[PDB]
Design an enzyme around this catalytic site. Structure first.
Site, short mmCIF file in Angstrom:
data_model
loop_
_atom_site.label_atom_id
_atom_site.label_comp_id
_atom_site.label_asym_id
_atom_site.label_seq_id
_atom_site.Cartn_x
_atom_site.Cartn_y
_atom_site.Cartn_z
CG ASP A 158 -2.39 -6.28 3.61
OD1 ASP A 158 -1.98 -6.25 2.41
OD2 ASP A 158 -1.78 -6.89 4.52
NE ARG A 192 -1.88 -1.92 3.36
CZ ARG A 192 -2.22 -2.27 4.60
NH1 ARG A 192 -3.44 -1.97 5.09
NH2 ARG A 192 -1.32 -2.91 5.35
#
Length: 154
Positions: free
Chosen positions: A126, A15
Protein backbone atom coordinates in the site's frame (compact mmCIF):
# COMPACT_ATOMS: atom_id res chain seq x y z
CA UNK A 1 -16.87 -10.89 -22.92
CA UNK A 2 -16.38 -14.38 -21.71
CA UNK A 3 -13.27 -13.65 -19.63
CA UNK A 4 -13.27 -11.55 -16.47
CA UNK A 5 -10.89 -10.22 -13.83
CA UNK A 6 -11.59 -8.12 -10.69
CA UNK A 7 -8.59 -6.42 -9.05
CA UNK A 8 -9.03 -5.84 -5.32
CA UNK A 9 -7.46 -3.82 -2.58
CA UNK A 10 -8.64 -2.49 0.79
CA UNK A 11 -9.89 0.92 -0.34
CA UNK A 12 -10.06 0.72 -4.17
CA UNK A 13 -8.31 4.08 -4.50
CA UNK A 14 -4.50 3.42 -4.74
CA UNK A 15 -3.59 0.00 -6.08
CA UNK A 16 -6.55 -1.82 -7.65
CA UNK A 17 -7.57 1.08 -9.89
CA UNK A 18 -4.09 1.18 -11.27
CA UNK A 19 -3.94 -2.61 -11.91
CA UNK A 20 -7.42 -2.32 -13.52
CA UNK A 21 -6.40 0.48 -15.85
CA UNK A 22 -3.08 -1.12 -16.73
CA UNK A 23 -4.86 -4.38 -17.69
CA UNK A 24 -7.57 -2.61 -19.74
CA UNK A 25 -4.95 -0.76 -21.78
CA UNK A 26 -3.03 -3.99 -22.33
CA UNK A 27 -6.06 -5.82 -23.72
CA UNK A 28 -7.20 -2.78 -25.70
CA UNK A 29 -3.79 -2.47 -27.34
CA UNK A 30 -3.96 -6.12 -28.44
CA UNK A 31 -7.48 -5.88 -29.87
CA UNK A 32 -9.06 -8.09 -27.24
CA UNK A 33 -10.89 -5.62 -24.91
CA UNK A 34 -14.28 -6.88 -26.18
CA UNK A 35 -13.28 -10.32 -24.85
CA UNK A 36 -12.62 -9.17 -21.31
CA UNK A 37 -14.70 -7.78 -18.47
CA UNK A 38 -12.28 -5.74 -16.31
CA UNK A 39 -13.05 -3.99 -12.99
CA UNK A 40 -11.78 -3.20 -9.49
CA UNK A 41 -13.20 -3.15 -5.99
CA UNK A 42 -12.52 -2.75 -2.27
CA UNK A 43 -12.72 -5.23 0.62
CA UNK A 44 -13.92 -2.31 2.77
CA UNK A 45 -16.37 0.55 2.62
CA UNK A 46 -13.91 3.28 3.60
CA UNK A 47 -13.74 4.97 0.17
CA UNK A 48 -17.03 4.12 -1.54
CA UNK A 49 -17.81 6.80 -4.09
CA UNK A 50 -14.28 8.26 -4.30
CA UNK A 51 -12.12 8.50 -7.37
CA UNK A 52 -8.60 7.10 -7.32
CA UNK A 53 -5.93 8.69 -5.13
CA UNK A 54 -4.75 11.78 -6.96
CA UNK A 55 -1.10 10.70 -6.57
CA UNK A 56 -2.18 7.62 -8.54
CA UNK A 57 -3.73 9.70 -11.36
CA UNK A 58 -0.57 11.75 -11.59
CA UNK A 59 1.54 8.63 -11.98
CA UNK A 60 -0.79 7.20 -14.62
CA UNK A 61 -0.81 10.48 -16.57
CA UNK A 62 3.02 10.24 -16.68
CA UNK A 63 2.61 6.87 -18.35
CA UNK A 64 -0.35 7.88 -20.51
CA UNK A 65 -2.81 5.35 -19.00
CA UNK A 66 -6.33 6.77 -18.60
CA UNK A 67 -7.94 6.10 -15.17
CA UNK A 68 -11.64 6.64 -14.56
CA UNK A 69 -13.12 4.81 -11.55
CA UNK A 70 -15.54 5.25 -8.67
CA UNK A 71 -14.57 3.20 -5.63
CA UNK A 72 -16.87 0.37 -4.73
CA UNK A 73 -16.96 -2.55 -2.32
CA UNK A 74 -16.90 -6.14 -3.53
CA UNK A 75 -20.30 -7.93 -3.42
CA UNK A 76 -21.47 -11.52 -3.08
CA UNK A 77 -22.25 -11.50 -6.83
CA UNK A 78 -18.61 -10.73 -7.69
CA UNK A 79 -17.51 -14.18 -6.44
CA UNK A 80 -20.01 -15.82 -8.90
CA UNK A 81 -19.41 -13.74 -11.88
CA UNK A 82 -15.64 -13.23 -12.11
CA UNK A 83 -13.13 -15.82 -13.33
CA UNK A 84 -10.24 -14.23 -11.33
CA UNK A 85 -9.99 -12.04 -8.24
CA UNK A 86 -6.46 -10.71 -8.01
CA UNK A 87 -5.51 -8.86 -4.89
CA UNK A 88 -2.61 -6.83 -3.68
CA UNK A 89 -1.41 -8.14 -0.31
CA UNK A 90 -1.87 -10.95 2.22
CA UNK A 91 -4.41 -8.93 4.24
CA UNK A 92 -6.66 -8.58 1.14
CA UNK A 93 -6.30 -12.30 0.57
CA UNK A 94 -7.38 -13.30 4.13
CA UNK A 95 -10.35 -10.93 3.85
CA UNK A 96 -11.32 -12.23 0.39
CA UNK A 97 -11.13 -15.91 1.49
CA UNK A 98 -13.27 -15.02 4.45
CA UNK A 99 -15.90 -13.39 2.26
CA UNK A 100 -15.68 -16.23 -0.30
CA UNK A 101 -16.80 -18.73 2.38
CA UNK A 102 -20.02 -16.81 3.11
CA UNK A 103 -21.38 -17.49 -0.44
CA UNK A 104 -22.48 -20.65 -2.26
CA UNK A 105 -21.06 -19.95 -5.68
CA UNK A 106 -17.46 -18.94 -5.82
CA UNK A 107 -16.35 -19.39 -9.40
CA UNK A 108 -13.46 -16.98 -8.97
CA UNK A 109 -9.88 -18.03 -8.38
CA UNK A 110 -8.71 -15.75 -5.63
CA UNK A 111 -4.92 -15.04 -5.90
CA UNK A 112 -2.34 -12.40 -5.30
CA UNK A 113 -1.65 -10.38 -8.39
CA UNK A 114 2.06 -10.45 -7.59
CA UNK A 115 2.14 -14.24 -7.83
CA UNK A 116 2.43 -13.49 -11.57
CA UNK A 117 5.55 -11.28 -11.37
CA UNK A 118 8.60 -12.59 -13.21
CA UNK A 119 10.74 -10.44 -10.88
CA UNK A 120 8.96 -12.34 -7.99
CA UNK A 121 7.78 -9.20 -6.05
CA UNK A 122 4.94 -11.08 -4.32
CA UNK A 123 3.28 -8.23 -2.38
CA UNK A 124 2.01 -5.03 -3.98
CA UNK A 125 2.36 -2.76 -0.92
CA UNK A 126 0.00 0.00 0.00
CA UNK A 127 1.49 3.39 -1.12
CA UNK A 128 -1.05 5.44 0.88
CA UNK A 129 1.51 6.59 3.49
CA UNK A 130 4.30 6.66 0.91
CA UNK A 131 5.18 9.12 -1.87
CA UNK A 132 5.46 9.15 -5.75
CA UNK A 133 8.32 6.70 -5.98
CA UNK A 134 5.95 4.13 -4.25
CA UNK A 135 3.09 4.79 -6.67
CA UNK A 136 5.67 4.30 -9.41
CA UNK A 137 6.74 0.99 -7.85
CA UNK A 138 3.07 -0.11 -7.76
CA UNK A 139 2.57 0.92 -11.40
CA UNK A 140 5.63 -1.08 -12.47
CA UNK A 141 4.59 -4.18 -10.54
CA UNK A 142 1.17 -3.98 -12.11
CA UNK A 143 2.62 -3.86 -15.63
CA UNK A 144 4.78 -6.95 -15.01
CA UNK A 145 2.02 -8.95 -13.32
CA UNK A 146 -0.72 -7.99 -15.80
CA UNK A 147 1.43 -8.88 -18.89
CA UNK A 148 2.12 -12.24 -17.25
CA UNK A 149 -1.43 -12.90 -16.09
CA UNK A 150 -2.67 -12.08 -19.55
CA UNK A 151 0.00 -14.27 -21.15
CA UNK A 152 -1.08 -17.27 -19.09
CA UNK A 153 -3.44 -17.58 -16.11
CA UNK A 154 -2.90 -20.08 -13.25
Amino acid sequence: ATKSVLFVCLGNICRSPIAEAVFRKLVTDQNISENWRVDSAATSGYEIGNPPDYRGQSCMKRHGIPMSHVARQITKEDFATFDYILCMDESNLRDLNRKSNQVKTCKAKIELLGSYDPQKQLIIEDPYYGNDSDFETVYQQCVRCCRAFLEKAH
